[PDB]
Symmetry: D2
């Protein structure tokens, strides 16, 4: 239940950095965005500018040793176990920009993990190194608009071998980060040989964004939020051709890569949602103590204290479920954590959604505005019931594993 000496030091360092360095910039960026739209002024394009202060924050973070903390390689990353990194991800979850500032954000962290493990020497030199430096961004392109992508076997976009080339065709969407000016490379997942054995029909391909035949068609909203500057895009691939060396690991290894990498990412997202919920609960308590109606602080009205209690309980038990999952990954590996990594995927976004909805209510109309981070937070938690696989698919995993115990 207690963290290592290193973890305790880093929790304090990360939280201090976020509150002192990141949050003033974060508040300023969000306020300026709100001011422009509130004034019905300016261009749409200017809302997508990368905040200049981010590179300055990244540099400061690097100088403080707060960089690549997600990556367990001690030479290239922070060397942290899952149990050590978990509480750091919670702290980063309290801030929109924090994961980026520490180079720990999705999808880049997951893509770096894929390249570190499965990339060729050249792929690592050309693409992993600039990602590790924070000099470029990437995206992971798996979901397809025209098929129900919650079942990966439905993928119809293709990456096929023709002579010494890989040839890529299709359309992907919800690609996080592709709107960013420095998103220079894509990991494309698609169908290769439908007649191969099950589990060997798909591939991942490393695709530079400047390859002819790629089009970022449009950016997508989540309840009206565009998540600038990286956004979530639609990407089409029309006769995109690369050297066959562009495959990651090789043709047919798509499923193996996904399974091989599974676990840490689920912990990272789930821990960020704990942080998000804490920020929401904190806002709820402050607002509810400060505002008065019907002769009382709002918190003292009706069921509000019961709601606060329920949120405290919910956060705490979910946090512990996630920390336990990290401990399993550290001790028994993914083979001993297969249920846990789906349990936390269901639990965390659902818990956060309910805490945040309670916090919004306590703020009245203002809760739905962007004068507070709650409205954006709600959408974030809601989206995480779908991103990386819907709740229902993960419940299916948990049920299957439970029922297998009775055979």
């Amino acid at each position: 239940f207690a963290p290592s000496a290193r973890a305790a030091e880093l929790i304090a360092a990360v939280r201090e950095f976020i509150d002192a360095e990141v949050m003033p910039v974060e508040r300023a960026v969000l306020a300026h965005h709100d001011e422009l739209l509130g004034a019905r002024a300016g261009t749409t394009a200017e809302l997508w500018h990368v905040p200049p202060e981010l590179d300055s924050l990244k540099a400061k973070a690097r100088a403080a040793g707060l960089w690549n903390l997600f990556l367990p390689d001690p030479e290239l990353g922070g060397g942290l176990s899952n149990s050590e990194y978990a509480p750091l991800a919670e702290q980063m979850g309290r801030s929109l920009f924090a994961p980026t500032v520490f180079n720990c954000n999705a999808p880049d962290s997951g893509n770096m993990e894929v390249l570190h493990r499965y990339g060729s020497q050249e792929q690592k030199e050309v693409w992993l190194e600039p990602l590790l430096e924070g000099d470029i961004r990437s995206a992971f392109c798996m979901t397809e608009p025209d098929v129900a992508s919650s079942d990966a076997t439905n993928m119809a976009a293709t990456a096929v071998v023709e002579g010494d080339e890989v040839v890529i065709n299709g359309r992907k969407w919800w690609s996080t980060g592709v709107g960013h000016p420095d998103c220079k490379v894509i990991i494309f997942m698609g169908l290769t040989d439908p007649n191969a054995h099950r589990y060997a029909r798909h591939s991942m391909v490393l695709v530079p964004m400047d390859t002819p035949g790629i089009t970022v068609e449009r950016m997508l909203p989540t309840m009206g939020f565009y998540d600038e500057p990286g956004g979530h895009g639609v990407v089409s691939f029309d006769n995109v051709r690369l050297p066959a060396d562009a495959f990651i690991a090789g043709p047919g290894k798509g499923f193996e890569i996904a399974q091989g990498r599974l676990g840490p990412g689920r912990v990272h997202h789930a821990m960020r949602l704990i942080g998000l919920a804490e920020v929401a609960l904190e806002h709820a308590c402050r607002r509810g103590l400060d505002r008065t109606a019907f002769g009382k602080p709002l918190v003292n009205l009706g069921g509000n204290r019961e709601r606060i209690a329920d949120a405290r309980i919910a956060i705490n038990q979910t946090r512990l479920l996630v920390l336990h999952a990290a401990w399993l990954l550290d001790t028994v590996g993914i083979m001993g954590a297969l249920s846990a990594v789906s349990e936390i995927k269901v639990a965390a976004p659902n818990m956060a959604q309910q805490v945040i909805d309670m916090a919004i209510q306590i703020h009245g109309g203002g809760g739905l505005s962007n004068d507070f981070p709650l409205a954006a937070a709600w959408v974030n938690a809601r989206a995480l019931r779908l991103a990386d696989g819907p709740d229902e698919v993960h419940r299916g995993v948990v049920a299957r594993i439970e029922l297998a115990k009775y055979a």
Copy 2:
């Protein structure tokens, strides 16, 4: 349980008009908005243009006799009872623009009701007539950002008599519609004499928007949605002075006006939410039958049919609770419907929120986008747990009335 001959005719006429005339325009407007933002193109200001097709739709509606259907006055409105109008409001709730097209939208419908009942002959000639014609828009300004406005007694913005003038000072927000270019008049609610008897301390004032000292400070988002072209604004009043004839009814009558008008508005909103939920359920069923994953239509997976059943039940029982409320208003009046008009205010938005969240989930990632109306619908239902008084305040009314039975 059955409607009048007139109501049956109008249900068919309104639904036909919405599907044939309104929805093609509605889809085009929403698509164009989405296309501009998706392309990261254009100005923010152009998103606020009033769709030119609305005046054409309003004219067609008027020509068909589908106009002012909310208003029970048979000369100036449709002459409909609450029971007759209720199912029409449900049909209008299926469409973003429909209430405007039939001149039945909030806040204008409520403001017209106030002026019809309490307006002087001159107020009715100058302001009610253009509202009834659909030539201008209005807003209702009661909520104040710096106080918890769920308790109306907290109002600190003032409308005070000084000689032959009324003098208005303060700040209001969440004023629906004030962004519209044709929003020409405001009904301001504020504190007049704090030392008067309880219930006689507040007033409503008819305030032309071009009066010196009024500033629309900014427009407000609800989860990133701005609800163009009318929006939701912040309005400040700095030494705004009008002839004392600008009071509606007279100084101190604010609470009396509010209580006197109570009932129909609650039915209108609650019925629109039934329509909104039906549209969401319909989308869920279509999508769930058409999309396939894990060997099955999505609807056939896991608990999805149970979710569909629960939504059907929820919509149906809530609809009937609202229709019953309309029947009470028609037979025993507001004095016999005091609990019912708060019951429906709690029930309808909570029911719709849950149906819509279920529908979004079934759509996968696309459910959160504006390729479908579900994301906007969710925010609409969520907001209606706060607009016109939070859930909690209305539960308080219902509880008080129930407990009074045991005295």
Copy 3:
């Protein structure tokens, strides 16, 4: 929304009779049962004695014209439409004994309906007449312990034609009422010819309880409650042989009988649950106003008023869903109410369970005792999520019918 003159008269008469005549006896019977068990005294067998006061209450009810009110035949019953009887069933739901006192209790009401519609002249003379007089009781034997009886096609108990006899074998359980000393006849449902067309494989048989080969094996608890004096039994049939005239309608007509009778029964049960919930809410309000803790009446603590409000809303909307179902049965018949009769089956017991659980909580420890009717009420509502088909099966019906609209 308003009832007929007859219905209004009967609502008042039934409620008056229940409160003045039935409830003093009901309270005395329950108190005596509680006193014996609380004292760890007496025999188990004496708890099953039929309260002598019931025949006196039945006679008084008959004399007042409050008899067979469920049965629409105006000669043999009350002549009431479903809409007229519905509010009477609500009033009866407020009392454990009331349905019996008015001869409107399940399973006898359903069995009388079957015999009235499908019985031969002789079956009606021998068995329907004494049931209509309240002189005997009956039971309906369909559910089988060794198969999942929620799917009627699983029935393995048999009723087969051999020459001029019907031969019955198998085991049934949860047979309501078979413990009663005057339970003289059973309607047995079983498999007849598995090779017949679908829907023509099952039969209902009228089986006198004194037929050789019938054994009432044991009585069953529902959370420790035995529901004396009728209880819920296990009944075995070993080479039970009757004249082939004992079939109701004829061999193979089991499904037709069930479908033909469907609707009114669902309304009766659902309306009784509305009454049950009202009694629970009333207890909650009285107790919560009278008891004081932490300086306040219990109702004024925490979320209790919100809970009271939610119960009022839940009861009211569910009531209206059921009254609407009765109206459909009266106007369009079962063919136009197929979804509604399953909607109410899901809605009513789930609503009542939650209201009752809230009421129990407000009573503290005493809520779980039989010093109040709440504990027994909870079990009643809980059981009605299973009796006459589980929630899930009924959700399946509702979903199927909804989805069929989009074909």
Copy 4:
């Protein structure tokens, strides 16, 4: 997250003993109880006989070193930390008799803790020693029927000093265990001096059950269950007089004793509920895999796998919340676990209630019977939302502590 070597050994030993030794007896006892009542046979009094096999099981447990495992004193108990004992309590929670067999049952464990810490040398020799040996039982008498005892300051039963005696008057109820033939002593909590300082107005008194003026008035049901042989009683005290040495610690120390003992008991109950929920989930999975309807195992129908997943998640996160609470008690003591010990009190019974209700449903009608332990389990979890203080009071504690962080 891992247990000590001792804890791992004892988890295996306790679980093995329960499954091999306790459960055959437990099943036989419950079956015999069910058989008698099902046959409408025998006396009520015979249902209260102490199963003879318990003393044999206690002796075997003692011989195996599985005795007084709750008590941290290494001479008199097992010497276990809270973290070590917690998983043992979970295993005991799987069985009705297990806590008694290991001498770890409430209320005796809590009473032993009180005497160990606060008892005089003589009180420990006369009463603690026979309790530690399992030779007698005890009860804790605090709750009073005529006042809302959720607020301890409402206590109106008195224990007052008159000369060299303590004089006790009043009525207590829900006293667990007082029906047992070997319940020889009571810890009475009552009002002593209402004019003393807050927190010094109440006392605990050690009261032999054979003292003149004590009457066990009646035993109480929880949904029809009497929890033989100890039950839950009503106890009246009429001019009960004892030497003033009968006070535990001294007059006025009632609140101090309660606060001083707080923590371990909450962990014990919460861990037992985890075990109870696991037994329910296990039953649900077995039944759902074995029974078939509509062409499928029941588990494969509708939302049942989602329900199984949700139960697995709920159990797991709640377990971890409780284990964390035990770790806090071991490291920072009750002063650092004040919120946690109320969080687990809310969380565990609510979690178990929902898992059990799901399990009952999957069993169909049989789920409500005592052919399985689920019906009794439901009542146990439900009761634990009230026993040792209602959910609402504990939510109040959690909220207060959370809100204090923002001062």
